[PDB]
Amino acid sequence: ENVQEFVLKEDCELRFAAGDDSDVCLELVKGYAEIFGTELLLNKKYTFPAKSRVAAFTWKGATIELVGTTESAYVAESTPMVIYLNIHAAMEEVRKKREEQAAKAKGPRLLLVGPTDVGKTTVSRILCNYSVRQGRTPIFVELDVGQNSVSVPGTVAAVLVQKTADVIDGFERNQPIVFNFGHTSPSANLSLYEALFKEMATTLNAQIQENDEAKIGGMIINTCGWVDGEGYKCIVKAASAFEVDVVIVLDHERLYSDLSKELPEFVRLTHVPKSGGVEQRTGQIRSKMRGENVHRYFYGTRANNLYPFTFDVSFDDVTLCKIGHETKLVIMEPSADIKHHLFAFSRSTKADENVLKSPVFGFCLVTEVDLEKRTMSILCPQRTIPSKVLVFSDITHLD
Ligand SMILES: Nc1ncnc2c1ncn2[C@@H]1O[C@H](COP(=O)(O)OP(=O)(O)O)[C@@H](O)[C@H]1O
Ligand SMILES: [Mg+2]
């Protein structure tokens, strides 16, 4: 196996992309290092899959071995990483201020905005890990229905962070809160999109009243890339709904300029550049990655395999429905057209107006439709269905 050795000076990162067709393994052999905020263990081997784009950064100096074929691999000497540490430091300062003023203290809340392909998701992950290493437990909030890191696409979601992200797998998806939007773009149904992120904010505000540690943890919030026309108005509305203290704008000067003139004055607005390590993606790449996220939901990861169940469900044992004039519930008659679509298990026990704003237990995928036998085959994370009310998503997946 072909090997590449890299010496990283303090404040440098090894940026690499796995080949189109192979894994790459990483081992820290001396010193200290981290990947998007999680500390590496000395002499532990970390294995990454094809087309991964990764950076391993060190604060003190490290020597790192890479095993396998790479499409690119270089050490960058200039990064925005101190910018992110300082965003973390400022958040923890706000916690301690509010803790002594409450002797319960409420943690700070941060909104990340900008167009697609600027490193927005990655920055969210760094900030979450730094909070955990400090002894704190933050809440991560995901509003990108096109590229979601907590649940399936076409969702808005949130999760309590109690341990640093796994280097390969990201954050433990241990009991998230999840809502189904059912399209990849907010422009498909603008008024529904806005209604869902409002309900998310309301739900989280009630949860933290029962957990002092999560309350003081605070929130880190990832947005979609729609910044023009009606997308602009969407950004302003999310900032008010989550009562954010801080807005971080990545790489859009007209947007930063326009928002400085509209946001309330107490909101701290910071423009930051995108990392030189972020590459432009195309229409086909995002669509492809949506498929891969769906696969993970059911089957898990290499390190922690999930073992999903495939079983049949009678149409008499469930109710199928679709949202959307724009935000009305419509009951679906099973047809050949639902094949390949995701459906959410609503926490609502009936197919009501309450379906619209209820979170979900999780999802299934409709793999087959037998119109004559009146059954469908589904893929499901647990042995029996957690709910009888199934909600349509326009997201399709060929499994
Ligand atoms: N410093 C970096 N070096 C190398 N790759 C990076 C770096 N930061 C982010 N990436 C990669 O670039 C891609 C795009 O980043 P992402 O955070 O998903 O962008 P956005 O959320 O703005 O669309 C991801 O594969 C991510 O892992
Ligand atoms: Mg993103």
Coordinates of C-alpha atoms and ligand atoms in Angstrom, one line a residue:
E1 CA 0.0 0.0 0.0
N2 CA 1.3 3.5 -1.0
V3 CA 2.1 5.8 1.9
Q4 CA 2.4 9.6 2.2
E5 CA 4.0 11.2 5.3
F6 CA 3.3 14.8 6.3
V7 CA 4.8 17.1 8.9
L8 CA 2.5 19.8 10.0
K9 CA 3.8 22.8 11.8
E10 CA 1.7 24.5 14.4
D11 CA -1.5 26.0 12.8
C12 CA -1.4 24.0 9.5
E13 CA -3.7 21.5 8.0
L14 CA -3.4 18.5 5.8
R15 CA -6.2 18.9 3.1
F16 CA -6.8 15.7 1.2
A17 CA -9.5 14.2 -1.1
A18 CA -9.9 10.5 -1.5
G19 CA -9.7 9.1 -5.0
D20 CA -12.8 8.5 -7.1
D21 CA -12.4 4.7 -6.4
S22 CA -10.7 4.0 -3.1
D23 CA -10.3 4.5 0.7
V24 CA -7.6 6.5 2.5
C25 CA -6.3 5.6 6.1
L26 CA -4.9 8.3 8.5
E27 CA -2.7 7.8 11.6
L28 CA -1.3 10.4 14.0
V29 CA 2.2 9.1 14.9
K30 CA 3.5 12.0 17.0
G31 CA 2.1 15.0 18.8
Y32 CA -1.5 16.2 18.7
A33 CA -4.1 16.9 16.0
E34 CA -7.9 17.2 15.2
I35 CA -10.4 16.7 12.4
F36 CA -13.1 19.4 12.1
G37 CA -12.8 19.7 16.0
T38 CA -12.4 16.2 17.3
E39 CA -9.0 15.2 18.9
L40 CA -7.2 12.3 17.3
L41 CA -5.8 9.4 19.5
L42 CA -2.1 8.7 19.2
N43 CA -1.5 5.7 17.0
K44 CA -5.2 5.1 16.2
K45 CA -6.0 4.3 12.6
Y46 CA -8.8 6.3 10.9
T47 CA -10.3 5.0 7.6
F48 CA -12.1 7.4 5.1
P49 CA -14.1 6.5 2.0
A50 CA -13.8 7.5 -1.7
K51 CA -14.4 11.1 -2.7
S52 CA -14.1 12.3 0.9
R53 CA -12.7 15.9 1.3
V54 CA -11.1 16.3 4.7
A55 CA -8.6 18.5 6.6
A56 CA -6.6 17.5 9.7
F57 CA -5.5 20.6 11.7
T58 CA -2.9 20.9 14.5
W59 CA -2.5 23.6 17.2
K60 CA 0.9 22.3 18.4
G61 CA 2.5 20.3 15.6
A62 CA 1.9 16.8 14.4
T63 CA 3.3 14.1 12.1
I64 CA 0.6 12.3 10.1
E65 CA 0.7 9.2 7.9
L66 CA -1.8 8.7 5.0
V67 CA -2.2 5.2 3.4
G68 CA -4.0 4.9 0.0
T69 CA -4.7 6.7 -3.3
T70 CA -5.6 10.5 -3.1
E71 CA -7.0 12.8 -5.8
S72 CA -5.3 15.7 -4.0
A73 CA -3.3 15.9 -0.7
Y74 CA -1.4 19.0 0.5
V75 CA -0.5 20.9 3.7
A76 CA -2.1 24.4 3.7
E77 CA -0.3 27.0 5.9
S78 CA -3.1 29.5 5.9
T79 CA -6.6 28.7 7.2
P80 CA -9.4 30.6 8.9
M81 CA -9.2 28.2 12.0
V82 CA -8.4 30.8 14.6
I83 CA -11.4 32.8 13.4
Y84 CA -13.6 29.7 14.5
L85 CA -11.8 29.2 17.8
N86 CA -12.5 32.8 18.6
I87 CA -16.2 32.4 17.7
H88 CA -16.2 29.5 20.2
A89 CA -14.3 31.5 22.9
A90 CA -16.8 34.3 22.6
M91 CA -19.7 32.0 23.0
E92 CA -18.2 30.4 26.2
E93 CA -17.6 33.9 27.6
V94 CA -21.3 34.6 27.1
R95 CA -22.2 31.4 29.0
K96 CA -20.0 32.3 32.1
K97 CA -21.4 35.9 32.1
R98 CA -25.0 34.5 32.0
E99 CA -24.2 31.7 34.6
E100 CA -23.0 34.1 37.3
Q101 CA -26.0 36.4 36.5
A102 CA -28.3 33.5 37.2
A103 CA -26.9 32.3 40.6
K104 CA -31.2 29.4 34.9
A105 CA -28.6 30.8 32.4
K106 CA -29.5 30.6 28.6
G107 CA -26.7 29.8 26.1
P108 CA -25.8 31.9 23.0
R109 CA -27.4 31.2 19.6
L110 CA -25.6 31.5 16.2
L111 CA -27.0 31.6 12.6
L112 CA -24.7 30.7 9.7
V113 CA -25.7 32.2 6.3
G114 CA -24.4 32.4 2.6
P115 CA -24.7 30.8 -0.8
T116 CA -23.9 27.2 -1.5
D117 CA -20.4 25.8 -1.5
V118 CA -18.8 28.1 1.2
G119 CA -18.0 25.6 4.1
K120 CA -21.1 26.4 6.2
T121 CA -21.8 22.8 7.4
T122 CA -18.1 22.2 8.3
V123 CA -17.9 25.4 10.4
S124 CA -21.1 24.2 12.3
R125 CA -19.3 21.0 13.2
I126 CA -16.1 22.6 14.5
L127 CA -18.1 25.0 16.8
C128 CA -20.1 22.1 18.3
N129 CA -17.0 20.0 19.1
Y130 CA -15.2 22.9 20.8
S131 CA -18.3 23.3 23.1
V132 CA -18.1 19.6 24.2
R133 CA -14.4 19.7 25.0
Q134 CA -15.2 22.7 27.2
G135 CA -17.5 20.4 29.3
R136 CA -20.7 21.8 27.7
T137 CA -23.5 20.2 25.8
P138 CA -24.8 22.4 22.8
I139 CA -27.8 22.0 20.4
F140 CA -27.1 21.7 16.7
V141 CA -30.0 22.9 14.3
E142 CA -30.1 21.9 10.6
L143 CA -32.3 24.0 8.2
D144 CA -30.8 22.9 4.8
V145 CA -33.5 20.6 3.3
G146 CA -31.1 20.1 0.3
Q147 CA -28.1 18.8 2.3
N148 CA -29.0 17.7 5.9
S149 CA -26.3 16.2 8.3
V150 CA -28.8 15.0 11.0
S151 CA -31.6 13.1 9.1
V152 CA -32.8 12.6 5.5
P153 CA -33.1 15.4 2.8
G154 CA -36.3 17.3 2.7
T155 CA -36.1 17.7 6.5
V156 CA -35.5 20.4 9.1
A157 CA -33.8 18.8 12.3
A158 CA -32.0 19.3 15.7
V159 CA -29.8 17.2 18.2
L160 CA -28.1 17.6 21.6
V161 CA -24.4 17.2 21.4
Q162 CA -22.8 15.3 24.5
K163 CA -19.7 13.8 22.9
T164 CA -17.3 15.0 20.2
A165 CA -18.2 14.0 16.6
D166 CA -16.8 10.7 15.5
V167 CA -14.0 11.5 13.0
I168 CA -15.5 9.4 10.2
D169 CA -19.2 9.3 11.1
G170 CA -19.9 12.8 12.5
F171 CA -22.2 13.4 15.5
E172 CA -24.1 10.6 17.2
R173 CA -27.7 10.8 16.0
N174 CA -29.0 9.9 19.5
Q175 CA -32.7 10.9 19.7
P176 CA -32.9 14.0 17.3
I177 CA -36.0 16.2 16.7
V178 CA -37.1 16.0 13.0
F179 CA -39.7 17.7 10.8
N180 CA -40.6 16.6 7.1
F181 CA -40.7 19.5 4.4
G182 CA -40.8 17.0 1.5
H183 CA -38.9 18.9 -1.2
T184 CA -35.2 19.6 -1.9
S185 CA -35.7 23.4 -2.5
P186 CA -37.6 26.0 -0.3
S187 CA -38.9 27.5 -3.6
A188 CA -41.1 24.5 -4.2
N189 CA -43.3 25.8 -1.3
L190 CA -42.1 28.9 0.3
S191 CA -44.8 29.4 2.9
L192 CA -44.5 25.8 4.2
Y193 CA -40.7 26.1 4.6
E194 CA -41.1 29.2 6.8
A195 CA -43.8 27.5 8.9
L196 CA -41.6 24.5 9.7
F197 CA -38.5 26.3 11.0
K198 CA -40.8 28.4 13.2
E199 CA -42.2 25.2 14.8
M200 CA -38.7 23.9 15.4
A201 CA -37.7 27.0 17.3
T202 CA -40.8 26.8 19.5
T203 CA -40.2 23.1 20.3
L204 CA -36.5 23.6 21.4
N205 CA -37.4 26.5 23.6
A206 CA -39.7 24.2 25.7
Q207 CA -37.1 21.3 25.9
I208 CA -34.3 23.4 27.4
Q209 CA -36.6 24.4 30.3
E210 CA -36.2 20.8 31.6
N211 CA -32.4 20.5 31.2
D212 CA -30.1 23.1 32.7
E213 CA -27.0 21.7 30.9
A214 CA -28.7 21.9 27.4
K215 CA -30.1 25.4 28.1
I216 CA -26.6 26.8 28.9
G217 CA -25.2 24.8 26.0
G218 CA -26.9 27.1 23.4
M219 CA -27.4 26.6 19.6
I220 CA -25.5 26.4 16.4
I221 CA -27.8 26.8 13.2
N222 CA -27.0 25.8 9.6
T223 CA -29.1 27.5 6.7
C224 CA -29.8 26.7 3.0
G225 CA -28.0 28.5 0.1
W226 CA -30.9 30.5 -1.4
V227 CA -29.8 34.2 -1.0
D228 CA -31.5 36.0 -4.0
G229 CA -35.1 37.3 -4.4
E230 CA -37.4 35.3 -2.0
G231 CA -34.4 33.5 -0.4
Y232 CA -33.2 36.8 1.1
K233 CA -36.5 37.3 3.0
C234 CA -36.2 33.7 4.3
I235 CA -32.9 34.5 6.0
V236 CA -34.3 37.5 7.8
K237 CA -37.3 35.4 9.0
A238 CA -35.0 32.5 10.4
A239 CA -33.0 35.1 12.4
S240 CA -36.1 36.4 14.2
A241 CA -37.7 32.9 14.8
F242 CA -34.6 31.5 16.6
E243 CA -33.9 34.8 18.5
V244 CA -30.2 34.6 17.3
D245 CA -27.5 36.6 19.1
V246 CA -25.0 36.2 16.2
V247 CA -25.2 35.9 12.4
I248 CA -22.1 34.6 10.6
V249 CA -22.1 35.4 6.8
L250 CA -19.7 33.3 4.7
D251 CA -18.5 34.8 1.4
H252 CA -21.3 37.2 0.2
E253 CA -20.6 40.9 0.4
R254 CA -23.9 42.2 -1.1
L255 CA -25.8 39.9 1.4
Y256 CA -23.8 41.1 4.4
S257 CA -24.4 44.7 3.2
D258 CA -28.1 44.2 2.8
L259 CA -28.5 42.3 6.1
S260 CA -26.6 45.0 8.1
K261 CA -29.3 47.5 7.1
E262 CA -32.3 45.2 8.1
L263 CA -31.2 43.1 11.2
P264 CA -31.9 44.4 14.7
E265 CA -28.9 46.3 16.1
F266 CA -28.2 43.9 19.0
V267 CA -27.5 41.0 16.6
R268 CA -23.7 40.7 16.1
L269 CA -23.1 40.3 12.3
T270 CA -19.7 38.9 11.2
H271 CA -18.5 38.4 7.6
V272 CA -16.0 35.5 7.3
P273 CA -14.3 34.2 4.2
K274 CA -14.7 30.6 2.9
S275 CA -11.7 28.4 3.5
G276 CA -9.4 27.9 0.5
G277 CA -10.2 24.2 1.0
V278 CA -13.8 24.5 -0.1
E279 CA -14.5 23.4 -3.8
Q280 CA -17.4 24.3 -6.1
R281 CA -20.0 21.5 -6.5
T282 CA -22.4 21.0 -9.4
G283 CA -26.1 20.1 -9.7
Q284 CA -25.4 16.4 -10.2
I285 CA -23.0 16.2 -7.2
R286 CA -25.6 17.5 -4.6
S287 CA -28.3 15.3 -6.1
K288 CA -25.9 12.3 -5.8
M289 CA -25.0 13.2 -2.1
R290 CA -28.7 13.3 -1.3
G291 CA -29.0 9.7 -2.3
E292 CA -26.0 8.7 -0.1
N293 CA -27.6 10.4 3.0
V294 CA -30.8 8.4 2.5
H295 CA -28.7 5.2 2.4
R296 CA -27.0 6.0 5.7
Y297 CA -30.2 6.7 7.5
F298 CA -31.2 3.0 7.1
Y299 CA -27.9 1.2 6.9
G300 CA -25.7 3.2 9.2
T301 CA -21.9 3.4 8.8
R302 CA -18.9 1.1 8.5
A303 CA -17.9 1.6 12.1
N304 CA -21.4 1.3 13.5
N305 CA -23.6 -0.8 11.2
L306 CA -27.4 -0.5 11.5
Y307 CA -29.4 -3.5 10.5
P308 CA -32.6 -2.3 8.9
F309 CA -35.8 -4.4 8.5
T310 CA -37.6 -5.0 5.2
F311 CA -41.3 -6.0 5.7
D312 CA -44.7 -5.6 4.1
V313 CA -47.5 -3.2 5.3
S314 CA -51.2 -3.4 4.3
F315 CA -52.8 -0.1 3.1
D316 CA -55.5 -0.8 5.6
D317 CA -53.0 -0.5 8.5
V318 CA -51.8 3.0 7.4
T319 CA -53.0 6.4 6.1
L320 CA -50.9 8.1 3.3
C321 CA -51.1 11.9 2.9
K322 CA -49.4 14.9 1.1
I323 CA -48.9 18.5 2.1
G324 CA -49.7 20.9 -0.8
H325 CA -53.5 25.1 -1.8
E326 CA -49.9 25.6 -0.6
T327 CA -50.1 24.3 3.0
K328 CA -53.2 22.1 3.0
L329 CA -53.2 18.3 3.8
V330 CA -54.4 16.1 0.9
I331 CA -55.2 12.4 1.4
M332 CA -53.5 10.1 -1.2
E333 CA -55.0 7.0 -2.7
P334 CA -52.1 4.6 -3.2
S335 CA -50.9 4.7 -6.8
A336 CA -47.9 3.5 -8.9
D337 CA -46.7 7.1 -8.4
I338 CA -45.7 6.7 -4.7
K339 CA -43.1 4.1 -5.6
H340 CA -39.5 5.1 -4.6
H341 CA -40.6 7.9 -2.4
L342 CA -39.7 8.5 1.3
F343 CA -42.5 8.7 3.8
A344 CA -42.3 10.1 7.4
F345 CA -43.9 8.4 10.5
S346 CA -45.7 11.3 12.1
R347 CA -45.9 11.6 15.8
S348 CA -49.5 12.8 15.3
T349 CA -51.9 9.8 15.8
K350 CA -54.3 11.1 13.1
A351 CA -54.1 12.6 9.6
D352 CA -55.0 16.1 10.8
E353 CA -54.0 19.7 10.5
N354 CA -51.6 18.6 13.3
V355 CA -49.7 16.5 10.7
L356 CA -48.4 19.8 9.2
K357 CA -46.5 20.8 12.5
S358 CA -45.8 17.4 14.3
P359 CA -42.3 16.1 14.4
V360 CA -41.6 12.5 13.1
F361 CA -40.4 9.3 14.7
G362 CA -38.3 8.6 11.6
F363 CA -38.7 7.5 8.0
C364 CA -39.3 4.6 5.7
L365 CA -38.8 4.1 1.9
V366 CA -41.4 2.6 -0.3
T367 CA -39.6 0.0 -2.4
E368 CA -42.7 -1.8 -3.9
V369 CA -46.4 -1.1 -4.5
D370 CA -48.8 -4.1 -5.0
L371 CA -52.0 -2.5 -6.1
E372 CA -53.8 -5.8 -6.4
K373 CA -52.7 -7.3 -3.0
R374 CA -53.1 -3.8 -1.4
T375 CA -49.6 -3.9 0.2
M376 CA -46.3 -2.1 -0.1
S377 CA -42.8 -3.1 0.9
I378 CA -40.9 -0.7 3.1
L379 CA -37.4 -0.4 4.5
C380 CA -37.5 0.5 8.2
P381 CA -35.0 1.1 11.1
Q382 CA -37.1 -0.9 13.6
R383 CA -39.0 -4.2 13.7
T384 CA -42.5 -2.7 13.7
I385 CA -43.8 0.7 12.5
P386 CA -43.7 3.4 15.2
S387 CA -46.7 5.2 13.7
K388 CA -49.7 4.6 11.4
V389 CA -49.7 8.1 9.7
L390 CA -47.3 8.2 6.8
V391 CA -46.4 11.6 5.2
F392 CA -45.4 12.0 1.5
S393 CA -42.0 13.4 0.5
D394 CA -41.2 14.3 -3.2
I395 CA -37.7 12.9 -2.5
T396 CA -37.2 9.6 -4.3
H397 CA -34.4 7.0 -3.8
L398 CA -33.7 3.9 -5.9
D399 CA -32.3 1.3 -3.4
Ligands
LIG1 N1 -10.6 23.2 5.1 C1 -11.1 22.2 4.3 N2 -10.3 21.5 3.6 C2 -10.7 20.5 2.7 N3 -12.0 20.3 2.5 C3 -12.9 21.0 3.2 C4 -12.5 22.0 4.1 N4 -13.6 22.6 4.6 C5 -14.7 21.9 4.1 N5 -14.2 21.0 3.3 C6 -15.0 20.1 2.4 O1 -15.7 20.9 1.4 C7 -17.0 20.3 1.1 C8 -18.0 21.4 1.2 O2 -18.1 21.8 2.6 P1 -19.6 22.1 3.2 O3 -19.2 22.5 4.6 O4 -20.5 20.9 3.0 O5 -20.1 23.4 2.3 P2 -21.5 24.1 2.3 O6 -22.2 23.6 3.6 O7 -21.2 25.6 2.4 O8 -22.1 23.8 1.0 C9 -17.2 19.2 2.1 O9 -16.8 17.9 1.5 C10 -16.2 19.5 3.2 O10 -15.8 18.3 3.9
MG2 MG -24.0 22.7 3.8

